[PDB]
Amino acid sequence: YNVFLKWSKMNLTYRIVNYTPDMTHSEVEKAFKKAFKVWSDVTPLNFTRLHDGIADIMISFGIKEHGDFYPFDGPSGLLAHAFPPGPNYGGDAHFDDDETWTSSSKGYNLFLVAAHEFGHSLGLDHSKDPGALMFPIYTYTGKSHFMLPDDDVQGIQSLYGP
Numbered sequence: 001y002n003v004f005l006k007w008s009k010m011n012l013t014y015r016i017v018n019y020t021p022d023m024t025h026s027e028v029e030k031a032f033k034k035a036f037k038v039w040s041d042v043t044p045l046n047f048t049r050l051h052d053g054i055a056d057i058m059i060s061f062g063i064k065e066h067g068d069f070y071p072f073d074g075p076s077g078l079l080a081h082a083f084p085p086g087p088n089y090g091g092d093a094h095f096d097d098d099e100t101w102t103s104s105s106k107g108y109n110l111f112l113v114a115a116h117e118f119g120h121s122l123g124l125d126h127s128k129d130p131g132a133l134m135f136p137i138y139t140y141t142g143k144s145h146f147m148l149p150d151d152d153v154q155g156i157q158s159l160y161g162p
C-alpha cells in the first residue's frame with residue numbers, strides 16, 4: 001500500500017449532494033453505503049449519511065469545471081477523484097458524469113470506483129500491488145461479492161487500526 005494525515009475522528013459523515021442520471025437515487029445510495037462498509041468492516045471508522053448541511057465527505061456528480069479547478073474531461077480519461085483527509089474539500093469525492101455509472105458492468109460500476117475513491121478520502125494513495133483496490137487501474141470481476149484485498153486492509157489499518 002502507499003500513504004503520502006488521517007481523520008482525527010472515527011465517526012465521519014457524508015452527504016450525497018446530487019445524483020447522476022444513470023442510476024436511481026436508491027441505487028446510488030446503496031452503492032456508496034456499500035463502498036463505505038468496505039472500510040468500516042476493517043477499521044473502527046463509522047459513517048453517517050447527512051441530508052443537508054456540510055459533511056466531512058461531500059459527494060457530487062459533475063462535468064468539466066465544477067468548482068475546484070480540477071475539471072473533468074468529458075467521455076473517457078478521468079472518471080473521478082477525491083481529496084485526502086482534511087476540512088472543506090478534504091475527503092470530498094467527485095464523479096465525472098460524462099461517464100456512464102452503473103450498479104452492474106455496462107459502464108463504470110459505481111460501487112467499485114466509490115470504494116476506491118473513499119480510499120483516498122480516508123488517506124490512502126495508490127498501491128503497487130496489482131490486485132489491490134487502491135491500484136490505479138479499474139476492473140470488473142464479474143462476481144457478486146467484494147472482499148477488500150489484504151493489502152488495502154493493511155493500508156487502511158495502518159492509519160486507523162482494526
Ligand SMILES: CC(C)[C@H](NS(=O)(=O)c1ccc(-c2ccc(NC(=O)c3cc4ccccc4o3)cc2)cc1)C(=O)O
Nearest residue numbers: 078079080081112113116131132133135136137138139
Ligand atoms: C489521482 C486521480 C487523478 C485519479 N483519477 S482517475 O479518474 O484517473 C481514476 C479513478 C479511480 C480509478 C480506480 C482504480 C482501481 C479501482 N479498483 C477496482 O476496480 C478493483 C476491483 C477489484 C476487485 C477485487 C480486488 C481489487 C479490486 O480493485 C477502481 C477505480 C482509476 C482512475 C484517481 O483518483 O485515481
Ligand SMILES: [Ca+2]
Nearest residue numbers: 074075076078
Ligand atoms: Ca472523463
Ligand SMILES: [Ca+2]
Nearest residue numbers: 056088089090
Ligand atoms: Ca470535506
Ligand SMILES: [Ca+2]
Nearest residue numbers: 097098099100
Ligand atoms: Ca453519466
Ligand SMILES: [Zn+2]
Nearest residue numbers: 066068070094
Ligand atoms: Zn472535483
Ligand SMILES: [Zn+2]
Nearest residue numbers: 116120126136
Ligand atoms: Zn486512485
